[PDB]
Design an enzyme around this catalytic site. Structure first.
Site, PDB file in Angstrom:
ATOM      1  N   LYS A 209       0.828  -1.202   0.000  1.00 54.20           N
ATOM      2  CA  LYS A 209       0.000   0.000   0.000  1.00 54.20           C
ATOM      3  C   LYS A 209       0.862   1.252   0.000  1.00 54.20           C
ATOM      4  CE  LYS A 209      -3.816   2.305   2.523  1.00 54.20           C
ATOM      5  NZ  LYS A 209      -4.551   2.398   3.837  1.00 54.20           N
ATOM      6  N   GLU A 215      10.359  -4.817   4.563  1.00 51.07           N
ATOM      7  CA  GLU A 215      10.396  -6.221   4.145  1.00 51.07           C
ATOM      8  C   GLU A 215      10.131  -6.356   2.653  1.00 51.07           C
ATOM      9  OE1 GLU A 215       8.803  -4.949   6.823  1.00 51.07           O
ATOM     10  OE2 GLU A 215       8.916  -6.312   8.537  1.00 51.07           O
ATOM     11  N   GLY A 269      -5.090  -2.133   4.827  1.00 49.51           N
ATOM     12  CA  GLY A 269      -4.318  -3.278   4.356  1.00 49.51           C
ATOM     13  C   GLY A 269      -5.020  -4.596   4.616  1.00 49.51           C
ATOM     14  N   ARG A 270      -5.492  -4.791   5.852  1.00 50.67           N
ATOM     15  CA  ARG A 270      -6.183  -6.010   6.258  1.00 50.67           C
ATOM     16  C   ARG A 270      -7.602  -6.096   5.719  1.00 50.67           C
ATOM     17  NH1 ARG A 270      -4.912  -2.605  10.296  1.00 50.67           N
ATOM     18  NH2 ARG A 270      -6.595  -1.614  11.523  1.00 50.67           N
ATOM     19  N   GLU A 355      -5.308  -6.899  14.700  1.00 49.61           N
ATOM     20  CA  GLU A 355      -4.755  -5.584  14.361  1.00 49.61           C
ATOM     21  C   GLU A 355      -5.831  -4.503  14.291  1.00 49.61           C
ATOM     22  OE1 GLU A 355      -0.989  -4.495  11.689  1.00 49.61           O
ATOM     23  OE2 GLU A 355      -2.765  -4.169  10.448  1.00 49.61           O
ATOM     24  N   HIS A 386      -6.676 -33.108  16.784  1.00 55.90           N
ATOM     25  CA  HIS A 386      -5.511 -33.906  17.147  1.00 55.90           C
ATOM     26  C   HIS A 386      -4.339 -33.041  17.576  1.00 55.90           C
ATOM     27  CE1 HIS A 386      -7.398 -37.511  15.236  1.00 55.90           C
ATOM     28  NE2 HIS A 386      -8.008 -36.550  14.560  1.00 55.90           N
ATOM     29  N   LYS A 514       8.937  -0.435  14.543  1.00 57.68           N
ATOM     30  CA  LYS A 514       9.576   0.051  13.320  1.00 57.68           C
ATOM     31  C   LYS A 514      10.701   1.041  13.617  1.00 57.68           C
ATOM     32  CE  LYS A 514       6.072  -0.544   9.815  1.00 57.68           C
ATOM     33  NZ  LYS A 514       5.635  -1.637  10.691  1.00 57.68           N
TER      34      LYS A 514
END
Ligand SMILES: O=P(O)(O)OC[C@H]1O[C@H](O)[C@H](O)[C@@H](O)[C@@H]1O
Length: 548
Positions: A209, A215, A269-270, A355, A386, A514
């Site tokens: 965005k 990263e 973003g999410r 978030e 399990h 950050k």
């Protein structure tokens, strides 16, 4: 600075009587059901091909209507329209919140800064459509003249999770293209992804965005360097596209403007996979299936917007979670999708929910003294049975869960689906009602245990039940039903955000990690003993320099 209303929930008349009803009532699922043969009929919504059964929740009619009262008293209807109609409800960033507009297909004209946005939305959609047809069809050749075979999306969080989950979920609907997903700044990630890839037939998608994320940009420059071992720099524009709001910073990367897939700051973003960010999804399953995905979301959209609260699925999901989180003191909410296609669904809701609502300051600027967003987690069924269902059945933790299932398997094999489905029904039944001491002693005598064995063993085999669950049955996993299911939770988070009186659409909590990382980065590159932090950060850093 108010758009959304700022009613503190612990102050409403509803929260008061909820606090009083909880204090004076045992919510025993076995009891509630024995008292009422119609409980399921009263506590479920059957919307077309979808059954949402909330009858295994720790609620009676009274608590139910009081939780509806609280959403009403928190002015939820007012909030819904402020969101959909584009009011600047992200107040700390002065932004609208219009992921819903991304899938309204121009049936509504939403205006932002005096500008209708639907022209913009449909342009990029049609842009993703034309682009992707050319990749899939093979008209768009790589630099040596070969068809793209491999698509690598590169981004993190909102630019990664949704494309990962959806592509994973709709694997049955796939194009010929192979999709790959680089996210971690850990270079072993892109290293392993590209290891058997051919830069002559690989298309890179740089989804960010902001297009400033460390990263992503590092992964982008590694992808470029890797590509440039075989290709020329003038070939970048043939194999690299970008999905961003930052067209200037993208263009400096060597990506052609024409291959910038724009989205906007009112797309969190999410909540962005519906936007340009969905392009890897467009290439993974074709645009027709992507439109089907956006249509499923719009249907949930229309349902959430117009349906009275007692019949409104995301509203119920929202108010039920407040119940458990603030009254039953439950810190988590399990997400248990009975489908291997939904293996990345819990992970996606982690960002969308936590978030969004992992906040401790209200819309008034005030610290809250009540719990807000819970911990979201899960794994598909039956796999989870399990791994951790032992703790859900018999630990000390109250864990509400959503059990999500499909009547039909896209691949029907022998008795697999009926066996899958047999677990789906049994585990919410077992969680709700358990198995009593007398039930246990009976099975133990029938097992031939002596009274000493029976004595020692009874409590270990008891299930007190009383774990609450929602059960979803869709007919089949398609783009449409996946679009419905994702948007149900999107609107769950919104509802809870509205009641909790927080901001679901900013994320100021990422800034300190950050910043501190920008200070340490140059410190790791030189050769000096670092002494500038606390003693732990000093020790960890210096230890790393001696072993890097
Ligand atoms: O899409 P980007 O701009 O690269 O941001 C990726 C992610 O990083 C941000 O800091 C937040 O953690 C998320 O809200 C976001 O989705």
């Amino acid at each position: 600075h108010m758009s959304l209303n700022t009613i503190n929930p612990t102050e409403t008349k509803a929260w008061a009587q909820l606090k009083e009803h909880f204090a004076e009532t045992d919510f025993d699922l076995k009891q509630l059901f024995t008292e009422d043969k119609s409980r399921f009929s009263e506590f479920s919504i059957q919307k077309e091909n979808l059954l949402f059964d909330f009858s295994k929740n720790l609620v009676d009619k009274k608590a139910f209507q009081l939780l509806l009262a609280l959403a009403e008293e928190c002015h939820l209807n007012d909030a819904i329209e402020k969101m959909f109609t584009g009011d600047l409800i992200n107040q700390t960033e002065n932004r609208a919140v219009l992921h819903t507009a991304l899938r309204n297909f121009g049936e509504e004209k939403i205006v932002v800064n005096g500008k209708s946005i639907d022209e913009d939305v449909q342009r990029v959609l049609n842009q993703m459509k034309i682009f992707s047809e050319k990749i899939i069809s093979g008209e768009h050749k790589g630099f040596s003249g070969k068809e793209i075979t491999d698509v690598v999306n590169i981004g993190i969080g909102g630019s990664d999770l949704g494309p990962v989950m959806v592509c994973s979920a709709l694997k049955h609907y796939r194009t010929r293209l192979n999709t790959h997903f680089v996210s971690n700044v850990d270079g072993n990630h892109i290293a392993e992804v590209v290891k058997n890839l051919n830069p002559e037939t690989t298309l890179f998608i740089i989804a960010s965005k902001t297009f400033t994320t460390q990263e992503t940009m590092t992964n982008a420059l590694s992808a470029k360097e890797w590509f440039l071992k075989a290709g020329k720099e003038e070939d970048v524009a043939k194999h690299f596209v970008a999905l961003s709001t930052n067209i200037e910073a993208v263009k400096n990367f060597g990506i052609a403007e024409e291959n910038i897939f724009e989205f906007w700051d009112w797309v969190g973003g999410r909540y962005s996979l519906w936007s340009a960010i969905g392009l890897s999804i467009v290439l993974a399953v074709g645009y027709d299936n992507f439109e089907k995905l956006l249509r499923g979301a719009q249907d949930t959209d229309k349902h959430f917007r117009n349906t009275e609260f007692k019949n409104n699925i995301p509203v119920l999901m929202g108010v039920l979670g407040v119940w458990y989180r603030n009254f039953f003191d439950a810190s988590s909410y399990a997400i248990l999708p009975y489908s291997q296609y939904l293996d990345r669904f819990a992970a996606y809701l982690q960002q969308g929910d936590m978030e969004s609502n992992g906040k401790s300051v209200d819309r008034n600027g005030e610290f809250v003294d009540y719990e807000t967003g819970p911990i979201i987690w899960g794994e598909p069924g039956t796999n989870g049975q399990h791994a951790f269902y032992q703790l859900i059945h018999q630990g000390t933790e109250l864990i509400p869960a959503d059990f999500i299932a499909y009547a039909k398997a896209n691949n029907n094999l022998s008795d697999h689906q009926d066996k899958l489905m047999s677990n789906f029904f049994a585990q919410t039944e077992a969680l709700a009602f358990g198995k009593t001491k007398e039930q246990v002693i009976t099975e133990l005598k029938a097992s031939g245990k002596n009274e000493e064995e029976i004595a020692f063993l009874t409590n270990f085999k008891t299930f007190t039940g009383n774990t609450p669950t929602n059960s979803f049955i869709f007919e089949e996993l398609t783009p449409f039903t996946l679009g419905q299911l994702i948007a149900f939770y999107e609107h769950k988070i919104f509802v809870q955000g509205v009641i909790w009186n927080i901001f679901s659409f900013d994320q100021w909590g990422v800034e300190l990690g950050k910043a501190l990382a920008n200070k340490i980065l140059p410190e790791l590159e030189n050769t000096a003993e670092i002494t500038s932090h606390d003693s732990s950060t000093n020790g960890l850093i210096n230890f790393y320099k001696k072993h890097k």
